[PDB]
């Protein structure tokens, strides 16, 4: 994916502070300033810090940038709900000859409990075999933070292969949802003991299996 | 005061060729060195393109050489990305941004974006499945079951449930773009499993680009004991 590491997901009060890290090596951070990207929900990103640690005009002092060896941090004080947003790191990296980015953190200002997602796994139906295609949909729910990671396993082995999933939106009671989809043929399908959807969320990760042999 | 707009952003076929602008204003372009950074829906940044403020210097992501190319005219203050051999991983937003190097690199300035959608497909009614309630669920309290609206074009299809006659516990899904070119969204609804029996649930799914409206009744599994 990303060539620099951050974080998927910080979360805090409102009126607390946050850090979100970035790493790397010597070819990008380590050699090179390095820029934070603020992306509010729906919006283009835009420039938060350069140079490390500068603020550009219109960012308030609540913000501010670290770089130490191949790590860049970004610290958010009086955190408040208008800073939730995905936030990148960048960098130039020689080794590369490239703009290098951080795969996101996605911050939560926290305004409700945190909660678990509940995870619906539904098979291929008998009408989408007979048509010869198969789709596994793992339906994820009841959850906040709203981000999630979804993992695919075939037995134990991952699939990256043939995976959709959708960015979490907000359900009726205002907990989180969001959708996988895994796209086989019925020869998958049927070639296999099980398929497991996997939700890591905070500190949990859970699971359901589903087999084409058994009644789900 | 500065500003970055692109332009030319659409639907184009995989090994298919389109281009994007970018007009900027507010200030002295031809002083700034001009970048290309995407994000496929729902994913991270990804830096594609950068040139230096006279043209004479390009510079590309490993995935896009020799399939695109960055150029601009300063006479006209635009920036454009020729895009080449698209493929459907190519599919994202195309943000133009400015990039600074007085002292490290970094892009100071962004466009709105344009949505770059990489897909063979023309309009397409809906395929609707059931997502039939587990069998592990039936024996009581509640059950999820749903509708899986799947290889449809464009967007979008709207669904409701028993004609709009069941709200309570109905979440349908924003869609994927599928390795396919097309569309698939799920909607769910939780149930009392008590129902199940003798209470009907249909989704009704509207496509109203194909005038295609697919009611489909969703029932407990024929492998489900408690049914
Ligand atoms: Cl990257
Ligand atoms: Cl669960
Ligand atoms: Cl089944
Ligand atoms: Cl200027
Ligand atoms: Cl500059």
């Known amino acids: 994916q990303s060539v620099l590491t951050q974080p998927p997901s910080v979360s805090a009060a409102p009126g607390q502070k946050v850090t979100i890290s970035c790493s790397g090596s010597?070819?990008?951070?380590?050699?090179?300033?390095v820029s934070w990207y603020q992306q509010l929900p729906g919006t283009a990103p835009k420039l938060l810090i350069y140079?490390?640690?500068e603020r550009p005009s219109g960012i308030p002092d609540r913000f501010s940038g670290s770089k130490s060896g191949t790590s860049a941090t970004l610290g958010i004080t009086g955190l408040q709900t208008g800073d939730e947003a995905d936030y990148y790191c960048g960098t130039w990296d020689s080794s590369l000859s490239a703009l290098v980015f951080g795969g996101g953190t996605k911050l939560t200002v926290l305004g409700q409990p945190k909660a678990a997602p509940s995870v619906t796994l539904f098979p291929p139906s008998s009408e989408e075999l007979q048509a010869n295609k198969a789709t596994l949909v793992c339906l994820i729910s009841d959850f906040y933070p709203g981000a999630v990671t979804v993992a695919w396993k075939a037995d134990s082995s991952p699939v990256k292969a043939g995976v959709e999933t959708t960015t979490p939106s907000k359900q009726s009671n205002n907990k989180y949802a969001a959708s996988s989809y895994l796209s086989l043929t019925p020869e998958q399908w049927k070639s296999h003991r099980s398929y497991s959807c996997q939700v890591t969320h905070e500190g949990s990760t859970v699971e359901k299996t589903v087999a084409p042999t058994e009644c789900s | 005061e500065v500003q970055l707009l692109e332009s030319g952003g659409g639907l184009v076929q995989p090994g298919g060729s389109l281009r994007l602008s970018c007009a900027a204003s507010?200030?002295?372009?031809?002083?700034?060195?001009m970048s290309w950074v995407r994000q496929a829906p729902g994913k991270g940044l990804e830096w594609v393109s950068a040139?230096?403020?006279?043209?004479?210097?390009?510079y590309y992501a490993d995935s896009v050489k020799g399939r695109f190319t960055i150029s601009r005219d300063n006479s006209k203050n635009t920036l454009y990305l020729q895009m080449n051999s698209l493929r459907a991983e190519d599919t994202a937003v195309y943000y133009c941004?400015?990039?600074?190097?007085?002292?490290?690199?970094?892009?100071?300035?962004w466009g709105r974006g344009t949505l770059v959608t990489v897909s063979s497909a023309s309009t397409k009614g809906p395929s609707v499945f059931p997502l039939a309630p587990s069998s592990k669920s039936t024996s009581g309290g509640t059950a999820a079951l749903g509708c899986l609206v799947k290889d449809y074009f464009p967007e979008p299809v709207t669904v409701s449930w028993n004609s709009g006659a069941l709200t309570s516990g109905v979440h349908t899904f924003p869609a994927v773009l599928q390795s396919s070119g097309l569309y698939s969204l799920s909607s769910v609804v939780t149930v009392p499993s008590s129902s199940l029996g003798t209470q009907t649930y249909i989704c009704n799914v509207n496509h109203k680009p194909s005038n295609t409206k697919v009611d489909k009744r969703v029932e407990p599994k024929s492998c489900d004991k408690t049914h």
């Open positions: 040139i230096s403020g006279s043209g004479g210097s390009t």
């Open positions: 507010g200030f002295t372009f031809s002083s700034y060195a």
């Open positions: 140079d490390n640690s």
């Open positions: 010597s070819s990008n951070i380590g050699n090179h300033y």
């Open positions: 941004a400015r990039l600074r190097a007085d002292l490290g690199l970094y892009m100071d300035l």
